[PDB]
């Protein structure tokens, strides 16, 4: 569709509350901190059906609308953490991972928007871990370095997901002080059958060791794969074998 | 200079024997007495007043005017001729692996396989003695073409290497599709690997993925014995550079 069409669609979905956040648990694999989750965005269309990412994110990102979606995500995430904490039965979240678009890392107004949300929701910055794909960070490196350093001065943590998807040099990493490398799911799914996938997981584990970074495996779909990641020394696991995404935003 | 200027210059240098080959030794780092002396041939050009001409003062012009296939053809013929003369000398150290660099132009040239076939017929070098070498950059920039090239040479019995491995803007995915025998790690990583643990890590990682994908590894620019020892411990297969042996005259 057109520019105008996609601006309306994103605006309308925001207006009708058709975006929602789920929280997927991330479990430690070694020897204890609070609950670790990653927030996942869901969009339902006007007739109530799930819209898969590939049916809206590519169009939104072409028109720079992912700034709007990220701003909604962060506000609603913070609000939900606060409202959640007012239920004394809910267990505290120690790490709440939130994905950001490349458009957001290139937006110089974002730091101010975030600073204000921290003040208003009284969130300890250290509890938030912002997450960008390796690909997006590397394609926009000058932006990512400055972005990550500004946010780190705020006190929050940082993650690269889809890590090693481009099987590239990790030299750039000397300039991004991120805390976590989250292994691309493609490598985890087939690491038991395909020795390249296994090797890539060992490599990532090794970068973690050398750079004092912690690692997370995405797409951990069986307990056998979980066990192999544990043996290698991967720090955390996420996916179908660990626990389902749960409603987070009300 | 002009097209005609560079045609003349390259021809004249060929005519006056001002191109020459040197051989730099490449040492095994691991166990096994299999295979004799491993070398890489290096091209040098001297000008009319006897001074070396650095690569960047002639390769770009040759590439620009499509003269590089001709220079490579000279390199390979002269390498073969020298290997034969060396084999006839009972005192000379036998060569098990002679590595010859080729240009991107040559990987795209379908007349090269026929020229090489003819050189094997005439000079009767055992093909398995030859290892052709192209940079990763050049191979990946022309991937389908490199695959065809490497497989045709492989059917001849020759081996293959990618040098300047992991220089610039590269990915390991391509490697699964390039049936080469050796990866030669770029010297950028090796030079500072004792001081910089990122460079060290990158050497270990390359060695790891290379081994898992069926390749033997070579480190270039090994400048001290301590660097050689560190590469040995990691499991790098071969070393090359100042601590191992300087280039020696090869072509008469
Ligand atoms: Mg993520
Ligand atoms: Mg070479």
Numbering used by the authors:
A (entry chain A): 546 to 576, 579 to 797
B (entry chain B): 546 to 797
What does the paper say about this structure?
RbdA is a membrane protein, containing two transmembrane regions with an interspersed periplasmatic domain of uncharacterised function. The PAS domain is followed by a DGC–PDE dimer. RbdA catalyses hydrolysis of c-di-GMP to pGpG as previously shown by high-performance liquid chromatography analysis. Thus, the RbdA PDE activity was suggested to down-regulate biofilm formation under normal circumstances.
RbdA shows an (β/α)8-type barrel fold with an inverted first beta-strand. In the structure, RbdA forms a dimer across helices α5 and α6, Fig. 1A. The RbdA-PDE dimer is observed with a single metal and no substrate c-di-GMP or product pGpG bound. Three metal binding sites have been identified in EAL-type phosphodiesterases. Nucleotide-free EAL-PDE structures typically contain one metal in what was called the M1 position, and this is also observed for dimeric nucleotide free RbdA, Fig. 2B. Metal coordination in RbdA involves the side chains of Glu585, Asn646, Glu678, Asp708, and two water molecules, leading to an octahedral binding geometry. RbdA forms a dimer interface of 715.8 Å2, as calculated by PISA. Instead, the PDE interfaces with the PAS domains (interface area 865.0 Å2) and the DGC domains (interface area 223.3 Å2). These interfaces with PAS/DGC domains in the autoinhibited state overlap with the interface in the dimeric form of RbdA, Fig. 1B, suggesting complex formation is mutually exclusive. The shorter helix is a hallmark structural change that was previously linked to activation as it allows engagement of the β5–α5 loop with metal cofactors in the active site. The structure of the dimeric RbdA PDE presented here is primed for substrate binding.
